[PDB]
Amino acid sequence: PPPAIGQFWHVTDLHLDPTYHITDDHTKVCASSKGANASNPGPFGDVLCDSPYQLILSAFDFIKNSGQEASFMIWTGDSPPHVPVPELSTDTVINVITNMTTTIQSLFPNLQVFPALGNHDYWPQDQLPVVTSKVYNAVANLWKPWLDEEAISTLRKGGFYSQKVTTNPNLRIISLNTNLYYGPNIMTLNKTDPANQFEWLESTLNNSQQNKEKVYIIAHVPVGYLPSSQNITAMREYYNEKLIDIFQKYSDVIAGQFYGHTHRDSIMVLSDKKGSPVNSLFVAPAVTPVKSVLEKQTNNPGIRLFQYDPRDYKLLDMLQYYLNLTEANLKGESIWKLEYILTQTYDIEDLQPESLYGLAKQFTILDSKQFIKYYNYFFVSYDSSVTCDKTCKAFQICAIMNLDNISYADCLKQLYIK
Numbered sequence: 436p437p438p439a440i441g442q443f444w445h446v447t448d449l450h451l452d453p454t455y456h457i458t459d460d461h462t463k464v465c466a467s468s469k470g471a472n473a474s475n476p477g478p479f480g481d482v483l484c485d486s487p488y489q490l491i492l493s494a495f496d497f498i499k500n501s502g503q504e505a506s507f508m509i510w511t512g513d514s515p516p517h518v519p520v521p522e523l524s525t526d527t528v529i530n531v532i533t534n535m536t537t538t539i540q541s542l543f544p545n546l547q548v549f550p551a552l553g554n555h556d557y558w559p560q561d562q563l564p565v566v567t568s569k570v571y572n573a574v575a576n577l578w579k580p581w582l583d584e585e586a587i588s589t590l591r592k593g594g595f596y597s598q599k600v601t602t603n604p605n606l607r608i609i610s611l612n613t614n615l616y617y618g619p620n621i622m623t624l625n626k627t628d629p630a631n632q633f634e635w636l637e638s639t640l641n642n643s644q645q646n647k648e649k650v651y652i653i654a655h656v657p658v659g660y661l662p663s664s665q666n667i668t669a670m671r672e673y674y675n676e677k678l679i680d681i682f683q684k685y686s687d688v689i690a691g692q693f694y695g696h697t698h699r700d701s702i703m704v705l706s707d708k709k710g711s712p713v714n715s716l717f718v719a720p721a722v723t724p725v726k727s728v729l730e731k732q733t734n735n736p737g738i739r740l741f742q743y744d745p746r747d748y749k750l751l752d753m754l755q756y757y758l759n760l761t762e763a764n765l766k767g768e769s770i771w772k773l774e775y776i777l778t779q780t781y782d783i784e785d786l787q788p789e790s791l792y793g794l795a796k797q798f799t800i801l802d803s804k805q806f807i808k809y810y811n812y813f814f815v816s817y818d819s820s821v822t823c824d825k826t827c828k829a830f831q832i833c834a835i836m837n838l839d840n841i842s843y844a845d846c847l848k849q850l851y852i853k
């Protein structure tokens with residue numbers, strides 16, 4: 436039993452659409468909808484539209500009014516909205532990051548925050564470079580009030596840094612720019628090691644290894660396989676394999692990992708080369724509810740809070756908060772509710788890797804009531820009469836339990852493939 440509980444927030448993929456507004460021509464409500472009629476728009480947004488400022492605002496207002504205390508906050512990026520490149524620019528990107536960064540800093544003057552860059556936090560999107568740049572330097576200025584000179588230094592070099600936490604200074608947050616590894620990123624094609632991030636990672640980890648230090652990885656694009664499709668890593672396979680090895684090697688140091696990018700609530704469990712679970716990974720869903728017209732599903736906006744043991748930074752639990760957008764628009768109020776408490780709904784001990792690996796196995800049971808939950812929660816309770824066939828479920832399961840491609844294919848073939 437632990438004598439006090441550490442808590443920190445994780446917010447991601449804010450995707451602000453400064454255009455949003457209610458008007459009678461639903462093609463004009465928000466530029467992110469790209470000309471489509473916004474399905475049923477309200478003051479807190481629309482499924483076809485990125486986040487109106489007031490949604491983003493209510494999310495942070497709920498945190499401040501939450502009645503939870505927190506040592507820090509993790510912010511995994513993607514702040515500009517989904518509109519085509521010509522419609523945007525480097526300066527707009529920066530104004531948007533600036534607004535977010537300021538808005539947070541105003542409401543949370545005393546709170547430390549550790550950002551990571553996402554793939555839309557650049558113009559043109561996804562083209563995050565190896566060497567310094569206007570955006571990298573822009574954010575370094577904006578995030579000074581939360582970071583070292585040492586941190587800040589590397590931040591401008593290639594979009595990344597690492598940082599002891601003020602209120603727990605043997606906890607080091609490592610913020611990675613995994614956008615360097617994202618498919619669409621033309622800057623990094625054919626590069627052995629973009630911005631020497633692997634070198635610096637291997638280096639930064641090895642260093643924490645010795646100094647009795649625990650590490651939390653923060654980043655935007657997760658490692659592993661995208662769970663709602665077949666044999667597609669989120670990053671470039673090549674890098675995913677490379678990163679997994681690194682995490683394998685130093686898993687004793689890493690006490691948790693945290694990502695966004697997918698806009699969905701997901702867990703993953705890294706196993707050692709031997710096949711034994713050794714690191715827990717957590718992909719938090721987005722604040723924006725945005726989606727394609729052809730897509731049945733999306734997320735409800737979401738916000739989450741983690742719990743740790745201040746001694747070893749072991750992960751005790753996670754509480755997932757959300758907005759029932761439809762309701763929130765019907766009432767025209769920000770009723771940020773609690774969706775679930777992780778150890779409660781799944782009836783497991785903690786967030787250790789063995790704990791979660793065990794839950795994963797329970798999912799594999801024919802008609803697992805457990806997996807059913809996990810799939811409601813996967814789209815942040817968005818439709819709850821939602822269902823899932825054997826194949827989709829297989830693609831989820833394998834993703835949760837297999838991070839590198841050997842073991843992901845074994846899991847796929849095992850049951851069954853073209």
Ligand SMILES: Nc1ccn([C@@H]2O[C@H](COP(=O)(O)O)[C@@H](O)[C@H]2O)c(=O)n1
Pocket residue numbers: 448513553554555696697698724725726727733
């Ligand atoms: N509404 C949305 C928005 C993004 N996505 C997916 O999640 C990822 C989100 O990346 P961005 O947030 O950088 O667009 C994309 O790879 C996209 O395929 C989705 O499935 N539904």
Ligand SMILES: *[C@@H]1O[C@H](CO)[C@@H](O)[C@H](O)[C@H]1NC(C)=O
Pocket residue numbers: 453454488533534537538
């Ligand atoms: C941020 O953006 C929104 C709309 O674009 C505006 O109403 C809000 O006041 C701005 N706030 C800051 C701190 O820039």
Ligand SMILES: *[C@@H]1O[C@H](CO)[C@@H](O)[C@H](O)[C@H]1NC(C)=O
Pocket residue numbers: 461462470471472
């Ligand atoms: C949007 O809404 C109006 C009213 O339903 C409709 O007549 C019009 O065709 C729609 N336009 C598009 C692009 O969907």
Ligand SMILES: *[C@@H]1O[C@H](CO)[C@@H](O)[C@H](O)[C@H]1NC(C)=O
Pocket residue numbers: 666672844
């Ligand atoms: C999975 O994807 C990679 C493409 O990156 C491919 O080379 C590999 O052969 C594929 N595996 C299967 C089972 O098709």
Ligand SMILES: [Zn+2]
Pocket residue numbers: 448450513696697698721
């Ligand atoms: Zn995003």
Ligand SMILES: [Zn+2]
Pocket residue numbers: 513553554555655695696697
């Ligand atoms: Zn993204």
